[PDB]
Amino acid sequence: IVEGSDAEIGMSPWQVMLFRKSPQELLCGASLISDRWVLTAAHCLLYPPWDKNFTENDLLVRIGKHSRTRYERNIEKISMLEKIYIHPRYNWRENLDRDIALMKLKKPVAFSDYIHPVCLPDRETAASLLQAGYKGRVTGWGNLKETWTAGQPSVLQVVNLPIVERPVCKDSTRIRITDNMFCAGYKPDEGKRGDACEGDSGGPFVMKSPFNNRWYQMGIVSWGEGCDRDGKYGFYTHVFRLKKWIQKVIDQFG
Amino acid sequence: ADCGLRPLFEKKSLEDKTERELLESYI
Amino acid sequence: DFEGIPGEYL
Ligand SMILES: CC1=C[C@@H](C(=O)N[C@H]2CC[C@H](c3cnc(N)[nH]3)CC2)n2c(=O)n(CC(c3ccccc3)c3ccccc3)c(=O)n2C1
């Protein structure tokens, strides 16, 4: 996270750390949507151009972590994957369009004060909360800065970010933005910064329903041009836009 | 349900240090 | 930088 702060213990019970067995390394973020399914971006898994194609056995999902590095025993739980499902129409070729992926747990994960799922948005909530100016919150153990001169943070990081208008998003970049993406961050005019960085991808972009006090995942951290650059915005999978899909595999495959 | 109601906060009726900000933003 | 995780996970 660029310009964030140390999160609070228990602050993001849905926070999933997608771990790599050899080498032992942070790979991405993800979120716990149920006792069996984790939610992530496809790009953490499949990026042909980067020779990136991870399989059910390359990864380890550690939930309930706080510390970036320490094996937090009796607190965190390392779990094994059944299957990975990538959106059939994910577009790594052109705009990373449909950057979504479901990961299935080998066994149900026991909820604790540290392990708790976030909700998926419905039409009405998605409707009333997904509006510009409206601040979401991003969490992850990614980089503090785009490149670090002088995988960085001690603990899970936090940053709250303003949802930006389409046309603003579209002006920002040269990439073909789609209905399935959304952008966030402070305009170069608002003297305020922060963003998701490298190692923050696939993690959750959540906002709180002033109606029910529930926290909802509105987006998955996607692509961007560097981290925290003036005039550019961070891009996000439109979680509610792809719900028909989630809903579908989740019941095809249980 | 219980989805999104955090046992260390929303459950003991406690607020986290930066949540205010949000709620305020849904102005 | 990561601390080693219990072996049965690997
Ligand atoms: C696995 C990949 C993930 C991601 C990444 O590394 N992303 C990096 C960069 C910032 C990102 C990020 C920062 N803040 C948010 N919200 N996301 C997280 C880490 N990605 C890119 O953004 N591009 C570059 C990008 C681009 C090209 C030309 C001009 C502007 C942006 C691109 C996006 C989508 C398809 C192809 C290229 C690319 O080739 N990949 C591959």
Active-site residue among A66, A79, A97, A99? A99
Task: Name the pairing type of β-strands A46-47 and A52-53.
Answer: antiparallel
Q: Is the dihedral of CA A11, A6, A205, A209 positive or negative?
A: positive
Sequential DSSP letters for A35-64: SSEEEE-GGGTEEGGGTEE--TTTEEEEES
Strand residues in chain A grouped as ranges (E): 5-6, 15-20, 25-32, 37-40, 46-47, 52-53, 59-63, 77-79, 81-86, 101-105, 135-140, 157-162, 181-184, 204-208, 215-221, 234-238
In the β-sheet with A15-20, what is the strand arrangement from edge to edge? A77-79, A59-63, A15-20, A25-32, A37-40, A101-105, A81-86
Q: Which domains, ranges and CATH numbers included, belong to chain A?
A: 1-12+118-240 (2.40.10.10), 13-117+241-253 (2.40.10.10)
The residues, any chain, with a CB within 8 Å of residue A113's CB and separated by 6 or more, are A10, A13, B7, B8
Work out the number of other CB atoms within 10 angstroms of the CB of residue A239: 27
Can you give the resolution of this entry in Å?
Answer: 2.7
Cα-Cα end-to-end distance for chain C = 18
Q: Assign A161 to helix, strand or coil.
A: strand
For a ligand 1 pocket test, name from A93, A223, A227 the mutation site with the most ligand atoms within 8 angstroms of its C-beta: A223
The residues in C 1-10 lying below 8 A from A, measured between CB atoms, are 1-6, 9-10
Residue A41 Cα to ligand 1 midpoint, Å, equals 12
Residue A149, Cβ density class (10 Å: 0-12 exposed, 13-18 middle, ≥19 buried): exposed
Residues present in chain C in total: 10
Please give the residue range of the domain that contains residue B27.
1-27
Task: Name the pairing type of β-strands A52-53 and A59-63.
Answer: unpaired
Domain count, chain B: 1
Residue B4: CATH number of its domain: 4.10.140.10
Separation of alpha carbons A249 and A245, rounded Å:
7
What's the gap in Å between the CA of B10 and the closest CA on chain A? 8
Chains that touch B (3 or more CB pairs under 8 A): A
Q: Closest partner residue to B22 among A11, A13, A160, by Cβ?
A: A160
Q: Assign A166 to helix, strand or coil.
A: helix
Check: CB of residue A56 under 8 Å from CB of residue A81. yes
